[PDB]
Structure formats: C-alpha cells, structure tokens
Amino acid sequence: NRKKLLLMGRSGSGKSSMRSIIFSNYSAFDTRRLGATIDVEHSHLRFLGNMTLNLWDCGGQDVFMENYFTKQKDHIFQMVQVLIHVFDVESTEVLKDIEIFAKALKQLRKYSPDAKIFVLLHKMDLVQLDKREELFQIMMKNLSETSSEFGFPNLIGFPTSIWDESLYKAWSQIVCSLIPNMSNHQSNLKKFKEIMNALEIILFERTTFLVICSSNGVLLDPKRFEKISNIMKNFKQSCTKLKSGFKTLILNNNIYVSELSSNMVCFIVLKDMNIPQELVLENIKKAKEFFQ
Amino acid sequence: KEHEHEQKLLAREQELRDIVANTNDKLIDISMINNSGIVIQGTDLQEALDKRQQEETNTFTLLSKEQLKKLHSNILNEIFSQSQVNKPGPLTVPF
Amino acid sequence: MLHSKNVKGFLENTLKPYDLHSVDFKTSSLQSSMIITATNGGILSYATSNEINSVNNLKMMSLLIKDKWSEDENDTEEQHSNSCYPVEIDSFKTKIYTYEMEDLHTCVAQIPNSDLLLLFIAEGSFPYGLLVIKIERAMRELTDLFGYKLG
Amino acid sequence: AMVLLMGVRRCGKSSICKVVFHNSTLIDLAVMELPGQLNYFEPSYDSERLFKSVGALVYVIDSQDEYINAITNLAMIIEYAYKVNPSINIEVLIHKVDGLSEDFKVDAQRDIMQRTGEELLELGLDGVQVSFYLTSIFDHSIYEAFSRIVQKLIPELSFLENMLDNLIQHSKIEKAFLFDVNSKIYVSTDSNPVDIQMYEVCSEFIDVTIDLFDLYKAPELQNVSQLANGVIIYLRQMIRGLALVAIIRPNGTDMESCLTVADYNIDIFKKGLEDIWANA
Amino acid sequence: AYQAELGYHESRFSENLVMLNLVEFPDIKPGDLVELKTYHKNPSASNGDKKIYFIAKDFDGETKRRAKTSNVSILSGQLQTLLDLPSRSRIWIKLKPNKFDLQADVVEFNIKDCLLNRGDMWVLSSKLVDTCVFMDQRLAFLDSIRGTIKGIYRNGKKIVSGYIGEQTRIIFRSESARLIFLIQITDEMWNFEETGEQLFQKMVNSFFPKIFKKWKD
Numbered sequence A: 001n002r003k004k005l006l007l008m009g010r011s012g013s014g015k016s017s018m019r020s021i022i023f024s025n026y027s028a029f030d031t032r033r034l035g036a037t038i039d040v041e042h043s044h045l046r047f048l049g050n051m052t053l054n055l056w057d058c059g060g061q062d063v064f065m066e067n068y069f070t071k072q073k074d075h076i077f078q079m080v081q082v083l084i085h086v087f088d089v090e091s092t093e094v095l096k097d098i099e100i101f102a103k104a105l106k107q108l109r110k111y112s113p114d115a116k117i118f119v120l121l122h123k124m125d126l127v128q129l130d131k132r133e134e135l136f137q138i139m140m141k142n143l144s145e146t147s148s149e150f151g152f153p154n155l156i157g158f159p160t161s162i163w164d165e166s167l168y169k170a171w172s173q174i175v176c177s178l179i180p181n182m183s184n185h186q187s188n189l190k191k192f193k194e195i196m197n198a199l200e201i202i203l204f205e206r207t208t209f210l211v212i213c214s215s216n217g218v219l220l221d222p223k224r225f226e227k228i229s230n231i232m233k234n235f236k237q238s239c240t241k242l243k244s245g246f247k248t249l250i251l252n253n254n255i256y257v258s259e260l261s262s263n264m265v266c267f268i269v270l271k272d273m274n275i276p277q278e279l280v281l282e283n284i285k286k287a288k289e290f291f292q
Numbered sequence B: 001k002e003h004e005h006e007q008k009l010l011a012r013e014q015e016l017r018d019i020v021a022n023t024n025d026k027l028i029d030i031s032m033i034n035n036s037g038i039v040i041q042g043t044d045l046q047e048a049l050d051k052r053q054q055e056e057t058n059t060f061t062l063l064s065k066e067q068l069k070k071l072h073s074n075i076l077n078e079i080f081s082q083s084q085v086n087k088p089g090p091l092t093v094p095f
Numbered sequence C: 001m002l003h004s005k006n007v008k009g010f011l012e013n014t015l016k017p018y019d020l021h022s023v024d025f026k027t028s029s030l031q032s033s034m035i036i037t038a039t040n041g042g043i044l045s046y047a048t049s050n051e052i053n054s055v056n057n058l059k060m061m062s063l064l065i066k067d068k069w070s071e072d073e074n075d076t077e078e079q080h081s082n083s084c085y086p087v088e089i090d091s092f093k094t095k096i097y098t099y100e101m102e103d104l105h106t107c108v109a110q111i112p113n114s115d116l117l118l119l120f121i122a123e124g125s126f127p128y129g130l131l132v133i134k135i136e137r138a139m140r141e142l143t144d145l146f147g148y149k150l151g
Numbered sequence D: 001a002m003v004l005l006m007g008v009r010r011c012g013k014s015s016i017c018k019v020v021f022h023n024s025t026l027i028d029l030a031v032m033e034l035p036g037q038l039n040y041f042e043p044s045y046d047s048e049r050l051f052k053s054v055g056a057l058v059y060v061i062d063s064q065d066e067y068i069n070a071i072t073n074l075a076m077i078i079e080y081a082y083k084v085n086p087s088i089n090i091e092v093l094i095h096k097v098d099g100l101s102e103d104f105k106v107d108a109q110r111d112i113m114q115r116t117g118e119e120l121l122e123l124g125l126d127g128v129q130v131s132f133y134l135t136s137i138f139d140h141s142i143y144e145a146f147s148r149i150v151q152k153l154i155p156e157l158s159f160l161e162n163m164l165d166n167l168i169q170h171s172k173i174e175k176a177f178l179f180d181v182n183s184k185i186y187v188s189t190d191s192n193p194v195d196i197q198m199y200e201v202c203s204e205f206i207d208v209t210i211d212l213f214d215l216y217k218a219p220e221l222q223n224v225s226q227l228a229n230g231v232i233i234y235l236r237q238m239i240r241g242l243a244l245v246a247i248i249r250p251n252g253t254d255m256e257s258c259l260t261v262a263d264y265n266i267d268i269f270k271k272g273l274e275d276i277w278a279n280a
Numbered sequence E: 001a002y003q004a005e006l007g008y009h010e011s012r013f014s015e016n017l018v019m020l021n022l023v024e025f026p027d028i029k030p031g032d033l034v035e036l037k038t039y040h041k042n043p044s045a046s047n048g049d050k051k052i053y054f055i056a057k058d059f060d061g062e063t064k065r066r067a068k069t070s071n072v073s074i075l076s077g078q079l080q081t082l083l084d085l086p087s088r089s090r091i092w093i094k095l096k097p098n099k100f101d102l103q104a105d106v107v108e109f110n111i112k113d114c115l116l117n118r119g120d121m122w123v124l125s126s127k128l129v130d131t132c133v134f135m136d137q138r139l140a141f142l143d144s145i146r147g148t149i150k151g152i153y154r155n156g157k158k159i160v161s162g163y164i165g166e167q168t169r170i171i172f173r174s175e176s177a178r179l180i181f182l183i184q185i186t187d188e189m190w191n192f193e194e195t196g197e198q199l200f201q202k203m204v205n206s207f208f209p210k211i212f213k214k215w216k217d
Ligand SMILES: Nc1nc2c(ncn2[C@@H]2O[C@H](COP(=O)(O)OP(=O)(O)O)[C@@H](O)[C@H]2O)c(=O)[nH]1
Pocket: A009, A010, A011, A012, A013, A014, A015, A016, A017, A018, A031, A032, A033, A034, A035, A036, A037, A059, A060, A122, A123, A124, A125, A160, A161, A162, A163
C-alpha cells in the first residue's frame, strides 16, 4: 500500500512549509527558517497503520523544473497517484505557472493517466479579505480550462494558507482520496452513531490530526472539521509541554475526544447531557477493536 | 465616618475568615473516602435494637390455618408480582 | 456494546414502589437505582425517583459503597453473616450485601460472573426483605448482561 | 478598578489592548488609552476626577527607542498623579523586549529604575513605589504583568490564596489557576510558584475549551483532559467571567475516584465563592 | 539515607535555595552538608538522576506555620530547572559529615562586563565559604556584579554541585578582558607549509576568523 504523491510548484510557493506543518510538526513561525529544496526531497510518512505515503517535495526553481520535463520525465511522473500543484498568488509570472502546470498535466497524462490532480492557491493571506474568493474563482476557471485540456475532467482546488486552518481541509481531502475501504469506515461510523445516539461522530488520524471521515458526510459551521483539526494540533503541542501525550478530552459531558485506537482519534458530539462518562467511555472501549 | 469604615473592614475580615473556615470544613480527602466507616452492615432487627437502645425476659408463652395459609401465599404472590420488571428492549446491541 | 436507553428504562422501572391491595401497606419509591463498576466504583448508569450536585453526591455514594463492598468480596472469615443473601440463579453464584448509610438503606449485588454491580438505595423506613426480593427479581431479568466485562 | 494605559505614540498601547482584551473591579473592562506627547501639562484642566477614577495607572516605555525623555514625561505625570490621590498604584511596562539578551534586559531595567528613582528624588516625591515589568506581546510576559496589576486591585487576595491552597491540599492538585474567560489574565493561584510552562498549558487549554465550545452552539463550562501519564487538567466555570483550571496529579490512584472527589471539592469551593462577591 | 517529599517556594517567603524541615528527621543539625540525591541504588542517566549538595537551613516561619507536607523545598528559577522534578516527588537525604574532606578543588567563575579588583575577587571568594554551589549558578556581588559557576572539580571529576571550603582553589576567569596580540612579521611568514599554505594565509584565513567566531559564540 504505497502511495506516490507529487508536490510541485514554483520557487517559494511554500510546498516544504505545507510538508513541515502537516507532517513534520512545525509551527507557522518555524517555516521561515526553511531553506530551498534542491532537486526532489523524498519523505516516507506512515499514515494510519497500513498506509505509506511517498511524498516528493519537488524543487520548483527554473533549472529543476526544466530538468523534470526533459530528462527525469520517465521517473518522476510514473506510478503517480496524486499530484498537488501549489500556486502562489504573489507570483507575477502567472502565465508561466499555468504553462508549467500544463506541462505537468501533459506528462502525467502521458505516463500515469489514472492520477488525481489537486491545486492549492497558497499564500492567500496577503490578499485583502474582500477580494479572496473572487480571485480563487478567477484563476480556477482558467485552471479548469487547462485541466480539461490535458485529460483530467475533474480538478479540485483549495484556497490555502499556513496562517489559517484551510491547509488541514485541503490535505485531509487530498489524503482521503487514497485511503482504502472508506465505505466500510462510513458504514461502521453510521452504525456507531446510531448505537450511541450521537449528533455527529468524526474520525481523525492520530499523528497528522487530519479528518478521515464524518458521520454526516440546528445549522452548523461547514468549516468545523478543519477548525477542530487546528485546535487538536494546538492542544497536542500544548500537552507536549507537560512531558506527556494527549489521551482524552470531555467538554460539557457532550463532546468526547478519545484515542479510539493507536492510529485514529474519535470526536463524538452526543445529544443528551445526562449520560454518565463511564458508559460513553466503555462504549468507546468496546468499539476500539471494531475499527481495527 | 472612616472609623465606621474601619469597623466595617473588621466585620469584613471576620466574615471572610468565617467564609474560609466554612469552605475549609467541607474538604474531603481520599483517606476520608477509604476509611469513612459510614457504610456499615445494617439489618432490620439490629436497627430496631439500636432504636430501642437510643429510646431507653421471655415475653412469649407457648400454648385459622386456612385463612393464614391463603393470606401468606397471597402476600408473597403480590410481592413477587410487582417485582417483575420487563425490559423495553435488548440491553446489548451487536455490530 | 451497550445501550444506555434500555438500561435507563430498566433502572427507571426498578424505581417503581409497592402498593399492596390485600393488605393496605404503601411503600415509598427507592431513592436511587444505579449500575456501577466492580473496579473503580463509578457510575455506569443511574436513575433517580425524582441536579449536578445530586449526581456528584450519588457518585460519591457509589464510590463509598464499592469501597465497602471490595473488602467484603475478598473476605472469607465470618462468611455465615446474617446480612449476606447469596443467591444462585441459572447456575450463577453471587453474593448480595445490605448496608446502612446513616438514614439510607443501600443494597448492592454483583452481577454474577461479571465486573458490574447493581445498587438500590432507599429511605430508612424501607424494609430490607423487600429490597432483597426486589434485587433478586431484578437480577433474574438481567440474563443478557451476564458475562460482560470492561474493555 | 479601571486602569489607564499611558504612553508615547507608537509605543504599542493599542496593540497590547487588542492582543490582551480582544484576542467594575475584576472583569476585563474597556480600559482607557491615553496618547501622551511631549508638551507642557496644563495645571488642573478638569483632570482631577479622571485620575481619581483610575485604580492603577500603567505607563508603557518602548525599549527599542530612546527613553530618557519618556522617563521625564512619566515623572511629570506621576508628579500630579500622586498629589491628587495618594492611593494609586503606579505601574511601568518596558515593552518590546523580544529581541534582547537577558543581561541587556536586566541592565535596561536597572537603568530605567535608577533614572526613575533619581527623577522622583529631584521632584521631591516620597513614599511612592513604582513597579516595573518587562513585557512583550509575542510571549507570556504581558499576561503576567496584567495579572500582577489586576491582583493589586482585588482586596480579597489572601483569602482567595487560602481557599485555593486548601482546595489544592485536599484534592492532590498540582497547580490551580483562577483564570478569567477573556484576556487569559489569571486572578489567583496558590503559594506555589507560577511556572511559565504550566501557565501556558492552562492558557491554551482555555483557548481549546472556548474554541471547541464555540464550534458547536445553539442547542457552565466543564472540562476533563487526561494525559498519558495520568495527569489531568480540569476546567469549571466560576461566577461571572471567572473560571478554574487545575492540573491535578493522580499519584497512582483511580482516575474516576479522583475525578469524583475533585468535582465534589470544586463544587464546594464554588459554593463558598458564591458567598464572597469576588465576581465582577 | 532518608526519604523526603520535594517542594517549591517563591522568593517572597525565603531567599535560600534549599530548605528542609528540621523537626522531621532530627539527625541533621542546623549547620550541615546534605546531599539531595533523587536515586536509591542503581543510578539512572537516561531517566535523569542528580546529586545536589547543599547546606541545611530551616523553613520560614510563614511556610512552616501554613504548611503542606513538602519536607524539602527548593527555590524556583535555576535550581528547579536543573533538578527538573514535579511539585511533589520522592527524594533522598544523607548527612555527609566530612566538610573538610568533601571540599571541591577548583570552582570556576565568570566576571563578564564588570571590573573586579584582585581584592574584590578575594572578598567574593571569602563570602563563598561554607556555601555549596552548582553549575551555572548566577551569583551576585554588590547587587550588580554577575557570576557564573562554570565548572566544579573534585578528585578529577567535574561534579554538578560541590561544597566550597577553606582549601578550595576558586578561580575567577574573565569573559570580558583586555587582550594584546603580537604578530611576528619575519622571513617565515611568506614561506610555505608542507600542504601548500603560506603561514600568514593560515593566520588571516584560519586562526583569526575561528577565534572571532568562538568569541561571538
Ligand atoms: N506570509 C506567508 N508566507 C508563506 C506562506 N506560505 C509559505 N510562506 C513562506 O515561504 C517560505 C518557505 O517557502 P518554501 O516552503 O521553502 O518554498 P518551496 O521550497 O518552493 O517549497 C517561508 O519563509 C514562508 O514565510 C503563507 O501562506 N503566508
């Protein structure tokens, strides 16, 4: 179960910043000290307990980018499952970025045409708040007209930044496109939701704290998953100060955050506030071996 | 008027010390939980004996059957009938 | 797994009082009816006849009752005690212990071959024999929870 | 107890207010900023009531820029502030000290203290004690400085200290803080030293609590967060904006028994806190 | 050996670093040298165990009156960070009675950015007698001069904490001092070494930059 993810972009696009924050556990202020990635940096990251991710943090500078599509084209773009192209909105060479993306799409269509393309419009915190979404539209349409040209009828894009929680949503949806047996996880989560009579049950990953699945797939915030992921990353970094690891968290006897297994974390919001804690904890412990 | 404020401050000091003493008196440690001694084995006869001890010889001398035999059985049946509790469904659900 | 709603309904039903008709002898309802663990003594499920303060007090009382029961379960001397009513239903042996907590009558019974306890607390005027019969007939209908251990 | 923030322009008063109070006596009230530029002070320009209505005056000195004129202006302010009301506590924050060494920080604080003392000796003010705190936005220093300033304006400090010490001694609590829901300004603690790491743990626990609660709304805040080593962190909302966060150690005991006795003890403590009008 | 519960206290109560309950374990007189080892047999390095010598002193009146266990209290700041133990832990206590035989041989010192006379060093060493020190302890002289105990030696071992006695050779190294360089310009400066480097090239390309980098570090 080896998944080959490519992480490409232009110079200074922030690819290694995403790789460090999501997986290597770096803060937002600690990405300024990062150097320039030379050629391709490989990272073998173990997701859940069975998945292994071969993330290829590519260079992004002009010599490396010209080298990718001429000499190493038979190596970087073969047996590829997911491409993640990072577009910087601070770039003044947007047409060159679109041409680089077109060459990457052409190579992927030539070699491994079953892959999944994702685009992240990074550094979307320097732009003013009023012109963000429209800008995300204005590029994306063009990218769609590019993406449908070289095969690939579908292309999913995300307005991302390292100073908010959108990175977690983008990376969660990128990673979840590779997780096997998602239907079984959804069915078991629905069964547990019916059994415990819970308002919403969300299943994460323990290390990266990315969302894996949700019970639902009073109006609630549509961006609650990424906010909970950011809050849990902050709480893990806070609990590292006490020389220990986070295990459980009970809020108002209504919100239970529990270590479901050695690779997942469950976030259960129930309906009745009068349930004793031990019954919910026991039912959590019974389902610990079920999701394994 | 400031002497009245001094007396008010003295009363406030006494009241705050009384509040501290009152909230200090209800603190229960785990040693108090483990060795409480409140939970003691009690029977009806021992409770009646303790009640008579706090309130304060062979009295009985050795000398119908149908009515007593009917009433005892009816009382036992009425006791056993109301103790029958029917569950509203299964207690443990499978996967 | 477990179902909190059915256990809640069962514990609410065990709060029903007795109203004898052949002999006019009305009894009050039990103060509380709960199912607790046999390891830490905390409340797994609970029900009251009639809010946070009472829940905390009931948890403290459950802890005290389990603390008193732990030494009684591990003691074999003076086994022929008058307050012990060991019943065996469906070839499953258990021991039932009654206690007096000031003005409260507390009857506890371990669910046989399992790590759970059932506890009924009533007022001081409640007879102990009716409590014993109540807890025996309650344990009679709990055959589905037999053999259940904490994970 | 309204505190007045004073300083030169571009010293950081608005940034401090935004960071702390935006993320009565004890609650984080809407404080008053006062941009004071160098000039000649008008004698009694209807400012007696204003400075009589300030519980404690806070002065902000930028350590990056030159500050001898700032100290002169501060002494000029104190010269009438102490004359109008002899009960005002006077506070000075040496702000923007993030990029300085420890020896440089200590020497700068000593120089500022000596200059302020010499200027107050020249102006003839006696019996005045001005406190100094090295503050910065990017770390915990400003929160602790405002904590000390607020603690100087609660007359029931020692009684709260005794109540928290008794609560800690009878619940196996490692460290208990009486935070406020906003601004993360802890109001009372025990006699144990305020560890910076534990304070940051409790503050980010406050943040996690409030954010997670705000994510699920529109249907008394309580929290138990247990770590791998059994150390638990507990939150219970007190009267008004106050909340209690306690790091409690199990010491090889039952988790649920410790939680039950801690809940009962903390409910008793809240019932005791209901009697004293320390809220708001 | 004895057993004790660790404690911490702020500088408001007491200024001493380590305090112990004199009423408990009354074998120790008020003036004594006491080890504060946290290990009882099989010392552990990965787990973290240290021996910290100190001089016995009684609790403060306010702390002894309003007391809450904690047979041994350590002042917060540097000693707490060095020990790195929770607020209530198990520690051990000995009563090493050979003050003369447990003297450290060499105790270092740093006098950066301040002028101490030779007699000032003598007086500061005289005040550091019958007082136990440890590594990186910032002493203070006349409330302005800062010190740093960067090394305590005994029997060829660099001990973490030591006892300074009457026969301890305490030295005062200076981190801000005047230096004179005397470079010989001779016929050999333009000669070549065996590898192929001129000697002045070594002086201006390898010696001076390294010494300036080390001075800045
Ligand atoms: N302000 C801001 N800076 C960013 C963002 N993303 C990345 N950066 C900057 O990008 C720099 C590192 O870029 P890097 O990951 O090495 O680019 P790469 O080598 O092409 O992957 C850091 O100094 C960050 O300050 C963002 O969303 N906002």
